Amino acid sequence: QIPLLEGETDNYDGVTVTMVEPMDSEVFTESLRASLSHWREEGKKGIWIKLPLGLANLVEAAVSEGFRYHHAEPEYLMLVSWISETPDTIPANASHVVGAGALVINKNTKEVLVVQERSGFFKDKNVWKLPTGVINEGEDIWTGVAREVEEETGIIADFVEVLAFRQSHKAILKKKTDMFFLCVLSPRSYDITEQKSEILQAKWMPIQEYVDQPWNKKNEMFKFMANICQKKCEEEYLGFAIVPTTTSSGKESFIYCNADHA
Amino acid sequence: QIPLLEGETDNYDGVTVTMVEPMDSEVFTESLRASLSHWREEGKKGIWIKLPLGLANLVEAAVSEGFRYHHAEPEYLMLVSWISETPDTIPANASHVVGAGALVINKNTKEVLVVQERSGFFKDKNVWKLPTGVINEGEDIWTGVAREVEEETGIIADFVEVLAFRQSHKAILKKKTDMFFLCVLSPRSYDITEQKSEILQAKWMPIQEYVDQPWNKKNEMFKFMANICQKKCEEEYLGFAIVPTTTSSGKESFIYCNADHA
């Protein structure tokens, strides 16, 4: 029978304890040690403790159990501890924009879905490209990429595998790096909804014709990427698939891996 | 023989044109159209044009060539256009913290390099973990992960391949997602520099012993990850390697892929 601190759980398996009533520090440390063992066995991750100024007598006890400072305001101090064996990343600032490209293949015709800007710089330059877009915060690569395809073409497509990825630095004035994943998706239909948005036009294009676009032969990187696409169309390329696994809290985590092995 | 606008090139194949002297708009658009074709063939990416208030007569001409607004101050407006066929990501905010874990294998002994906190929460809980750390802005996954290993243990290790990755949301209060790459690295020596930092202790550990840690058997995700590590120690797991390729500007871009195919 254990003295558990009352805490509010969040959607990310964190617990936030808001202290209110005075408490003796050694009663606090007994309760906190037992609460931490309980939370760890329930697979909690971030543990947050809000201590008002009037409860400054508890700050040392929290720090002794492994809490560090997170922030403070005149009336309270917020402490945090990472109690999961996964990486502790609390202090890190976001460094990357994450994007994905979609190889959508009609397996009957070996044609791939492509788009072309109706403006600005790339009209009317006849550049036909794989659908691409950025992954929003709280979104998976696998759902995010499918969303992009249907927002552009109306086609619903299921994520199959990641074929390749790469980092790049896009431009001066944004000190952040872009990460791009080339994904293969399987379409549920083939009928493109004409003019889904004003920005883009879409069609099916034979894989060889996608590869042979002069823009796509311009440098080694484009040719390399396009060649990975063609080899996948030829069923000669094994990428990384998703495998759902259960975390200590019961939630599902998708692992991208060589699914065959693993 | 072409009328090229004077621009300052940056380390990311962008060009920043700072307009100063008055210019007629149709002379500007002729010069800008030719400059853009030149820049595109030289593999430039972001094109920036700074137009002072006094040169407001050029704003329309720039917009007609595909520029969009970036920012403005009372005395000038900055416009931008993306002229590379790679994804245009200028407006996107950084959404991800990127981290990596290091599987460092002694191939003579099938032992892996592991670390344990000397504080706070995880002393003295006997959790032995693969070295991990975050990838800084402007850093590759492959160099970033190696840096972490030597900062922790003193061992210099060469990046070999990515075995798996996954996204997760770490905690409330940071609306950003963590991306984690499990990487295998090849050590250049085996002598650990005792107490490289105060935070961690490091040793070599047999792969079976790493896998059998009770914490590592706690849930399906940990077991799954640990099993990918063991299969790589058994030479039964093919991950993604790096292949350097040349971009249109002559710089090297590392593609993570199934290197065998591709």
Coordinates of C-alpha atoms in Angstrom, one line a residue:
Chain A
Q1 CA 0.0 0.0 0.0
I2 CA 1.8 3.2 -1.3
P3 CA 1.5 7.0 -0.7
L4 CA 1.1 8.3 -4.2
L5 CA 1.2 12.0 -5.0
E6 CA -1.8 13.2 -7.0
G7 CA -0.8 14.1 -10.5
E8 CA -2.5 14.9 -13.8
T9 CA -1.6 12.6 -16.6
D10 CA -1.2 13.9 -20.1
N11 CA -1.5 12.3 -23.6
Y12 CA 2.3 11.7 -23.7
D13 CA 2.6 9.5 -20.6
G14 CA 3.8 12.5 -18.4
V15 CA 2.5 13.3 -14.9
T16 CA 2.2 16.8 -13.6
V17 CA 2.1 17.1 -9.8
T18 CA 0.8 20.5 -8.6
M19 CA 1.7 20.9 -4.9
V20 CA -0.7 23.1 -2.9
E21 CA -0.9 22.2 0.8
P22 CA 2.2 22.4 3.1
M23 CA 4.0 19.1 3.6
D24 CA 7.0 18.0 5.6
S25 CA 10.0 17.3 3.5
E26 CA 10.7 13.7 4.6
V27 CA 7.0 12.8 4.1
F28 CA 7.4 14.4 0.7
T29 CA 10.5 12.4 -0.2
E30 CA 8.9 9.1 1.0
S31 CA 5.8 9.8 -1.1
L32 CA 8.0 10.9 -4.1
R33 CA 10.2 7.8 -4.1
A34 CA 7.2 5.5 -4.0
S35 CA 5.4 7.6 -6.6
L36 CA 8.4 7.4 -9.0
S37 CA 8.6 3.6 -8.7
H38 CA 4.9 3.4 -9.4
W39 CA 5.1 5.8 -12.4
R40 CA 8.1 4.0 -13.8
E41 CA 6.4 0.6 -13.7
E42 CA 3.3 2.2 -15.4
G43 CA 5.7 3.4 -18.2
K44 CA 5.5 7.2 -17.5
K45 CA 8.0 9.4 -19.1
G46 CA 8.2 13.1 -18.1
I47 CA 7.4 13.8 -14.4
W48 CA 6.7 17.4 -13.6
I49 CA 6.4 19.0 -10.2
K50 CA 5.1 22.5 -9.7
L51 CA 6.2 23.9 -6.3
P52 CA 4.8 27.2 -5.1
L53 CA 7.1 29.7 -3.3
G54 CA 5.5 28.8 0.1
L55 CA 6.6 25.1 -0.5
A56 CA 10.3 26.0 -1.1
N57 CA 11.1 23.4 1.7
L58 CA 10.4 20.6 -0.8
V59 CA 12.8 21.8 -3.5
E60 CA 15.9 20.1 -2.1
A61 CA 14.0 16.8 -1.6
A62 CA 12.8 16.8 -5.2
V63 CA 16.3 17.6 -6.5
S64 CA 17.8 14.7 -4.4
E65 CA 15.4 12.3 -6.3
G66 CA 16.8 13.4 -9.7
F67 CA 14.7 16.4 -10.6
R68 CA 16.2 19.3 -12.5
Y69 CA 14.8 22.8 -12.9
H70 CA 12.6 23.6 -15.9
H71 CA 11.3 27.1 -15.4
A72 CA 10.3 29.4 -12.7
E73 CA 7.9 32.4 -12.1
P74 CA 7.8 34.6 -9.0
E75 CA 5.2 32.4 -7.4
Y76 CA 6.4 28.9 -8.3
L77 CA 9.3 26.7 -9.6
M78 CA 8.7 23.8 -12.1
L79 CA 10.9 20.8 -11.9
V80 CA 11.2 17.9 -14.3
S81 CA 12.7 14.4 -14.3
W82 CA 12.9 11.8 -17.2
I83 CA 12.1 8.4 -15.8
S84 CA 11.9 6.4 -19.0
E85 CA 14.9 4.5 -20.5
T86 CA 14.3 6.2 -23.9
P87 CA 16.4 9.3 -24.6
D88 CA 16.0 12.4 -22.4
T89 CA 15.6 15.2 -24.8
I90 CA 13.7 17.8 -22.7
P91 CA 16.2 20.7 -23.1
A92 CA 16.6 20.2 -26.9
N93 CA 15.2 22.8 -29.4
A94 CA 13.6 21.7 -32.6
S95 CA 16.3 21.7 -35.3
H96 CA 14.6 20.0 -38.4
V97 CA 11.9 20.5 -40.9
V98 CA 10.7 17.0 -41.9
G99 CA 9.3 16.3 -45.4
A100 CA 8.4 13.4 -47.5
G101 CA 8.1 12.5 -51.2
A102 CA 5.5 10.1 -52.5
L103 CA 6.2 7.4 -55.1
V104 CA 2.7 6.3 -56.0
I105 CA 2.8 3.4 -58.4
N106 CA 0.0 2.0 -60.7
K107 CA 1.3 -1.7 -60.7
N108 CA -0.8 -2.5 -63.8
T109 CA 0.9 0.1 -66.0
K110 CA 4.2 0.9 -64.1
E111 CA 3.1 4.5 -64.1
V112 CA 3.8 6.9 -61.2
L113 CA 1.8 9.9 -60.0
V114 CA 3.4 13.2 -60.8
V115 CA 2.6 16.9 -60.3
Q116 CA 3.6 20.2 -61.9
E117 CA 3.3 23.8 -60.6
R118 CA 0.8 26.1 -62.3
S119 CA 3.0 28.9 -60.8
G120 CA 5.3 30.6 -60.0
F121 CA 8.9 30.0 -61.1
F122 CA 8.2 26.5 -62.4
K123 CA 5.4 27.3 -64.9
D124 CA 5.8 26.7 -67.7
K125 CA 9.0 24.8 -67.3
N126 CA 7.5 21.3 -67.7
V127 CA 9.0 19.8 -64.5
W128 CA 7.0 16.8 -63.5
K129 CA 7.7 15.8 -59.9
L130 CA 6.7 13.2 -57.3
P131 CA 4.1 14.8 -54.8
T132 CA 6.0 16.2 -51.7
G133 CA 5.0 18.0 -48.6
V134 CA 6.1 18.8 -45.0
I135 CA 5.2 16.6 -42.0
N136 CA 3.4 18.7 -39.4
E137 CA 4.1 18.5 -35.7
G138 CA 2.3 15.4 -34.1
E139 CA 2.0 13.7 -37.5
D140 CA 3.7 10.5 -38.6
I141 CA 5.8 10.4 -41.8
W142 CA 3.5 7.6 -43.1
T143 CA 0.2 9.4 -42.6
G144 CA 1.6 12.8 -43.4
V145 CA 2.8 11.7 -46.8
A146 CA -0.5 10.1 -47.7
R147 CA -2.3 13.3 -46.7
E148 CA -0.2 15.3 -49.2
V149 CA -1.1 13.0 -52.1
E150 CA -4.8 13.2 -51.5
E151 CA -4.7 17.0 -50.9
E152 CA -3.0 17.3 -54.3
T153 CA -4.7 14.6 -56.5
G154 CA -7.7 13.2 -54.6
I155 CA -6.2 9.7 -54.6
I156 CA -6.2 7.8 -51.3
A157 CA -2.9 5.9 -51.0
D158 CA -1.5 3.5 -48.3
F159 CA 2.0 3.9 -46.9
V160 CA 4.2 1.0 -47.9
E161 CA 7.9 1.8 -47.2
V162 CA 10.6 4.5 -46.9
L163 CA 13.1 4.1 -49.8
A164 CA 15.7 6.7 -48.8
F165 CA 16.3 9.8 -46.8
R166 CA 18.7 12.8 -46.7
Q167 CA 19.4 16.0 -44.8
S168 CA 20.1 19.3 -46.4
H169 CA 20.4 22.9 -45.5
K170 CA 17.9 24.8 -47.6
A171 CA 18.7 28.5 -47.4
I172 CA 20.4 31.3 -45.5
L173 CA 18.1 33.1 -42.8
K174 CA 16.7 29.8 -41.4
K175 CA 19.3 28.0 -39.3
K176 CA 17.5 24.6 -39.5
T177 CA 18.0 21.5 -41.5
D178 CA 15.5 19.8 -43.8
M179 CA 15.1 16.0 -43.6
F180 CA 13.4 14.4 -46.6
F181 CA 12.0 10.8 -46.8
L182 CA 11.3 9.2 -50.2
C183 CA 8.3 7.0 -49.5
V184 CA 6.4 4.5 -51.6
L185 CA 2.6 4.5 -51.3
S186 CA 0.0 2.1 -52.8
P187 CA -3.0 3.9 -54.5
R188 CA -6.6 2.7 -53.7
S189 CA -7.9 4.2 -57.0
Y190 CA -6.4 5.8 -60.1
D191 CA -9.0 8.5 -61.0
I192 CA -7.5 11.9 -60.4
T193 CA -9.9 14.6 -59.3
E194 CA -9.2 17.3 -61.9
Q195 CA -8.0 20.6 -60.3
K196 CA -8.0 19.6 -56.6
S197 CA -6.1 22.9 -55.9
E198 CA -5.2 25.8 -58.2
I199 CA -1.4 25.4 -57.5
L200 CA -0.9 22.0 -59.2
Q201 CA -1.8 19.8 -62.1
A202 CA -1.5 16.0 -61.8
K203 CA -1.2 13.0 -64.1
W204 CA 0.1 9.4 -64.3
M205 CA 3.4 9.1 -66.1
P206 CA 5.4 6.0 -67.2
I207 CA 8.4 5.4 -64.9
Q208 CA 10.9 5.6 -67.7
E209 CA 9.5 8.9 -68.8
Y210 CA 9.8 10.3 -65.2
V211 CA 13.4 9.1 -65.1
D212 CA 14.3 10.6 -68.5
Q213 CA 13.1 14.2 -67.9
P214 CA 16.2 16.4 -68.6
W215 CA 15.9 18.1 -65.2
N216 CA 16.0 14.6 -63.7
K217 CA 19.3 13.9 -65.5
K218 CA 20.8 17.2 -64.4
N219 CA 23.0 15.9 -61.6
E220 CA 24.1 12.7 -59.8
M221 CA 21.7 13.2 -56.9
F222 CA 18.5 13.4 -59.0
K223 CA 19.6 10.5 -61.2
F224 CA 20.4 8.5 -58.0
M225 CA 16.9 9.2 -56.4
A226 CA 15.1 8.6 -59.7
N227 CA 17.0 5.3 -60.1
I228 CA 15.8 4.1 -56.6
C229 CA 12.3 4.9 -57.8
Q230 CA 12.7 2.8 -61.0
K231 CA 14.2 -0.1 -59.2
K232 CA 11.2 -0.1 -56.8
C233 CA 8.8 -0.1 -59.8
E234 CA 10.9 -3.1 -61.0
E235 CA 10.4 -4.8 -57.6
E236 CA 14.2 -4.7 -57.2
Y237 CA 14.5 -2.5 -54.1
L238 CA 13.9 -3.3 -50.5
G239 CA 13.2 -0.3 -48.2
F240 CA 12.2 0.2 -44.6
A241 CA 8.7 -0.7 -43.5
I242 CA 6.8 0.1 -40.4
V243 CA 6.3 -2.3 -37.5
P244 CA 3.9 -1.3 -34.7
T245 CA 5.2 -2.1 -31.2
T246 CA 3.8 -1.6 -27.7
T247 CA 5.5 0.8 -25.2
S248 CA 5.5 0.4 -21.4
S249 CA 2.4 2.5 -21.2
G250 CA 0.4 0.4 -23.7
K251 CA 0.6 2.9 -26.6
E252 CA 1.7 2.0 -30.1
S253 CA 5.0 3.1 -31.5
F254 CA 5.9 2.6 -35.2
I255 CA 9.4 1.4 -35.9
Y256 CA 10.8 2.0 -39.4
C257 CA 13.1 -0.9 -40.2
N258 CA 14.1 -3.6 -42.6
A259 CA 10.8 -5.5 -41.5
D260 CA 11.9 -8.8 -43.0
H261 CA 14.7 -9.0 -40.5
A262 CA 13.9 -7.6 -37.0
Chain B
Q1 CA 26.3 37.5 -73.5
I2 CA 23.8 38.0 -70.5
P3 CA 22.9 40.9 -68.2
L4 CA 23.4 39.3 -64.8
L5 CA 22.3 41.0 -61.5
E6 CA 25.0 41.2 -59.0
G7 CA 24.3 39.0 -56.1
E8 CA 26.0 37.6 -53.0
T9 CA 26.3 33.8 -52.9
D10 CA 26.0 32.0 -49.6
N11 CA 27.1 28.6 -48.4
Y12 CA 23.7 27.0 -49.2
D13 CA 23.8 27.8 -53.0
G14 CA 21.5 30.8 -52.4
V15 CA 21.9 34.2 -54.1
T16 CA 21.0 37.5 -52.4
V17 CA 20.6 40.5 -54.7
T18 CA 20.6 43.8 -52.9
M19 CA 19.1 46.5 -55.2
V20 CA 20.5 50.0 -54.8
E21 CA 20.5 52.2 -57.9
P22 CA 17.2 53.1 -59.7
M23 CA 16.4 50.8 -62.7
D24 CA 13.6 50.8 -65.2
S25 CA 11.3 47.8 -64.6
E26 CA 11.5 46.2 -68.1
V27 CA 15.3 46.4 -67.9
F28 CA 15.0 44.8 -64.5
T29 CA 12.7 42.0 -65.8
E30 CA 15.0 41.2 -68.7
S31 CA 18.0 41.1 -66.4
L32 CA 16.1 39.0 -63.8
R33 CA 14.8 36.4 -66.4
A34 CA 18.4 35.9 -67.7
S35 CA 19.8 35.9 -64.2
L36 CA 17.4 33.2 -63.1
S37 CA 18.2 30.9 -66.1
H38 CA 21.9 31.3 -65.3
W39 CA 21.4 30.6 -61.6
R40 CA 19.2 27.6 -62.3
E41 CA 21.9 26.1 -64.6
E42 CA 24.5 26.7 -61.8
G43 CA 22.3 24.8 -59.4
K44 CA 21.3 27.7 -57.1
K45 CA 18.4 27.2 -54.7
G46 CA 17.1 30.2 -52.8
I47 CA 17.1 33.5 -54.7
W48 CA 16.6 36.5 -52.5
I49 CA 15.9 40.1 -53.7
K50 CA 16.1 43.0 -51.3
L51 CA 14.2 46.0 -52.7
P52 CA 14.4 49.4 -50.9
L53 CA 11.2 51.5 -50.7
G54 CA 12.6 53.9 -53.4
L55 CA 12.7 50.9 -55.8
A56 CA 9.0 49.9 -55.3
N57 CA 8.7 50.1 -59.1
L58 CA 10.4 46.7 -59.4
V59 CA 8.2 44.8 -57.0
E60 CA 5.6 43.8 -59.6
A61 CA 8.3 42.7 -62.1
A62 CA 9.9 40.4 -59.4
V63 CA 6.5 39.0 -58.5
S64 CA 5.7 38.2 -62.2
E65 CA 8.9 36.1 -62.3
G66 CA 7.7 33.9 -59.4
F67 CA 9.0 35.7 -56.3
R68 CA 6.9 35.7 -53.1
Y69 CA 7.2 38.0 -50.1
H70 CA 9.5 37.0 -47.3
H71 CA 9.6 39.9 -44.9
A72 CA 9.6 43.7 -45.0
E73 CA 10.8 46.6 -42.9
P74 CA 9.8 50.3 -43.4
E75 CA 12.8 50.8 -45.7
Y76 CA 12.8 47.6 -47.8
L77 CA 10.9 44.5 -48.9
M78 CA 12.6 41.1 -49.2
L79 CA 11.4 38.7 -51.8
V80 CA 12.3 35.0 -52.4
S81 CA 11.9 32.3 -55.0
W82 CA 12.9 28.7 -55.0
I83 CA 14.4 27.7 -58.2
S84 CA 15.7 24.2 -57.5
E85 CA 13.5 21.1 -58.2
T86 CA 14.1 19.9 -54.7
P87 CA 11.2 20.7 -52.2
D88 CA 10.5 24.3 -51.4
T89 CA 10.3 24.5 -47.7
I90 CA 11.1 28.2 -47.0
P91 CA 7.9 28.9 -44.9
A92 CA 8.1 25.7 -42.8
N93 CA 9.0 26.0 -39.1
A94 CA 11.3 23.4 -37.4
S95 CA 9.1 20.7 -36.0
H96 CA 11.6 17.9 -34.9
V97 CA 14.4 17.2 -32.5
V98 CA 16.6 14.6 -34.1
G99 CA 18.7 12.1 -32.1
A100 CA 20.7 9.0 -32.7
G101 CA 21.7 5.9 -30.8
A102 CA 25.0 4.1 -31.3
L103 CA 25.5 0.4 -31.6
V104 CA 29.2 0.1 -31.3
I105 CA 30.4 -3.5 -31.8
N106 CA 33.7 -5.2 -30.9
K107 CA 33.6 -7.8 -33.7
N108 CA 36.2 -10.0 -31.9
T109 CA 34.1 -10.4 -28.8
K110 CA 30.5 -9.6 -29.9
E111 CA 30.4 -7.0 -27.1
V112 CA 28.7 -3.6 -27.5
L113 CA 29.6 -0.3 -25.9
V114 CA 27.2 0.8 -23.1
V115 CA 26.8 3.7 -20.7
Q116 CA 25.0 4.3 -17.4
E117 CA 24.1 7.5 -15.6
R118 CA 26.0 8.5 -12.5
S119 CA 23.0 10.7 -11.7
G120 CA 20.1 11.7 -11.4
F121 CA 17.0 9.4 -11.5
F122 CA 18.9 6.4 -13.1
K123 CA 21.6 6.1 -10.4
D124 CA 21.8 3.5 -9.0
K125 CA 19.3 1.6 -11.1
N126 CA 21.8 -0.4 -13.2
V127 CA 20.4 0.5 -16.6
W128 CA 23.1 0.0 -19.2
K129 CA 22.3 1.8 -22.5
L130 CA 23.6 2.4 -25.9
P131 CA 25.2 5.8 -26.2
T132 CA 22.7 8.4 -27.5
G133 CA 22.6 12.1 -28.1
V134 CA 20.9 14.8 -30.2
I135 CA 22.0 16.0 -33.6
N136 CA 22.7 19.7 -33.7
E137 CA 21.7 22.0 -36.5
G138 CA 24.1 21.8 -39.4
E139 CA 25.3 18.3 -38.4
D140 CA 24.8 15.0 -40.2
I141 CA 23.2 12.1 -38.4
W142 CA 26.4 10.0 -39.2
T143 CA 29.0 12.5 -37.8
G144 CA 26.7 13.6 -35.0
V145 CA 26.3 10.1 -33.6
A146 CA 30.1 9.5 -33.7
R147 CA 30.7 12.7 -31.8
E148 CA 28.4 11.5 -29.0
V149 CA 30.3 8.2 -28.6
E150 CA 33.7 9.9 -28.3
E151 CA 32.4 12.7 -26.0
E152 CA 31.2 9.9 -23.7
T153 CA 33.9 7.2 -24.0
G154 CA 36.9 8.6 -25.9
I155 CA 36.5 5.9 -28.6
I156 CA 36.6 7.1 -32.2
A157 CA 34.0 5.2 -34.3
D158 CA 33.1 5.2 -38.0
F159 CA 29.4 5.4 -39.1
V160 CA 28.3 2.2 -40.9
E161 CA 24.5 2.2 -41.2
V162 CA 21.1 3.3 -39.9
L163 CA 19.3 0.2 -38.5
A164 CA 15.9 1.7 -37.6
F165 CA 14.2 4.9 -36.7
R166 CA 11.0 6.2 -35.0
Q167 CA 9.1 9.4 -34.1
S168 CA 7.7 10.0 -30.7
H169 CA 6.2 12.9 -28.7
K170 CA 8.4 13.3 -25.6
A171 CA 6.4 15.5 -23.2
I172 CA 3.7 18.1 -22.7
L173 CA 5.1 21.8 -22.9
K174 CA 7.1 21.2 -26.0
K175 CA 4.9 20.9 -29.1
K176 CA 7.7 19.2 -31.2
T177 CA 8.4 15.6 -32.2
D178 CA 11.5 13.6 -31.6
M179 CA 13.0 11.5 -34.3
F180 CA 15.5 8.8 -33.2
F181 CA 17.9 6.9 -35.5
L182 CA 19.5 3.6 -34.3
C183 CA 22.9 3.6 -36.0
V184 CA 25.7 1.0 -36.1
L185 CA 29.2 2.4 -35.8
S186 CA 32.6 0.6 -36.2
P187 CA 35.1 1.4 -33.4
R188 CA 38.8 2.3 -34.2
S189 CA 40.0 1.2 -30.8
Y190 CA 38.6 -0.5 -27.7
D191 CA 40.3 1.3 -24.8
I192 CA 37.8 3.4 -22.9
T193 CA 39.2 6.7 -21.4
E194 CA 38.0 6.3 -17.8
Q195 CA 35.7 9.1 -16.6
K196 CA 35.5 11.2 -19.8
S197 CA 32.7 13.2 -18.2
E198 CA 31.2 13.1 -14.7
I199 CA 27.7 12.2 -15.9
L200 CA 28.4 8.7 -17.3
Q201 CA 30.3 5.5 -16.8
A202 CA 31.1 3.3 -19.8
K203 CA 32.1 -0.4 -20.5
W204 CA 31.9 -3.2 -23.1
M205 CA 29.1 -5.6 -22.5
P206 CA 28.3 -9.0 -24.3
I207 CA 25.3 -8.5 -26.7
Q208 CA 23.2 -11.2 -24.9
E209 CA 23.7 -9.5 -21.6
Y210 CA 22.6 -6.2 -23.1
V211 CA 19.5 -7.8 -24.5
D212 CA 18.7 -9.7 -21.2
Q213 CA 18.6 -6.6 -19.0
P214 CA 15.2 -6.7 -17.2
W215 CA 14.5 -3.1 -18.3
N216 CA 15.2 -4.1 -21.8
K217 CA 12.6 -6.9 -21.6
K218 CA 10.0 -4.5 -20.1
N219 CA 7.9 -3.9 -23.2
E220 CA 7.6 -5.0 -26.9
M221 CA 9.4 -1.8 -28.3
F222 CA 12.6 -2.3 -26.2
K223 CA 12.7 -6.0 -27.0
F224 CA 12.2 -5.2 -30.7
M225 CA 15.0 -2.6 -30.8
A226 CA 17.3 -4.8 -28.8
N227 CA 16.6 -7.7 -31.2
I228 CA 17.5 -5.6 -34.2
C229 CA 20.8 -4.9 -32.4
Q230 CA 21.5 -8.6 -31.7
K231 CA 20.7 -9.6 -35.3
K232 CA 23.2 -7.0 -36.5
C233 CA 25.8 -8.4 -34.1
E234 CA 25.0 -11.8 -35.8
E235 CA 25.5 -10.2 -39.2
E236 CA 21.8 -11.0 -40.0
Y237 CA 20.5 -7.5 -40.5
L238 CA 20.8 -5.2 -43.5
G239 CA 20.2 -1.5 -42.7
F240 CA 20.6 1.8 -44.7
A241 CA 24.0 3.0 -45.6
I242 CA 25.2 6.3 -46.9
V243 CA 26.0 7.1 -50.5
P244 CA 27.5 10.5 -51.4
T245 CA 26.1 12.1 -54.6
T246 CA 26.8 15.3 -56.4
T247 CA 24.2 18.1 -56.5
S248 CA 23.8 20.6 -59.4
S249 CA 26.1 23.0 -57.6
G250 CA 28.9 20.5 -57.1
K251 CA 28.4 19.9 -53.4
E252 CA 28.0 16.4 -51.9
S253 CA 24.8 15.2 -50.5
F254 CA 24.6 11.9 -48.5
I255 CA 21.7 9.6 -49.4
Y256 CA 20.7 7.0 -46.7
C257 CA 19.5 4.0 -48.6
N258 CA 19.7 0.3 -49.1
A259 CA 23.1 0.9 -50.7
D260 CA 23.3 -2.6 -52.3
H261 CA 20.4 -1.7 -54.5
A262 CA 20.2 1.9 -55.8

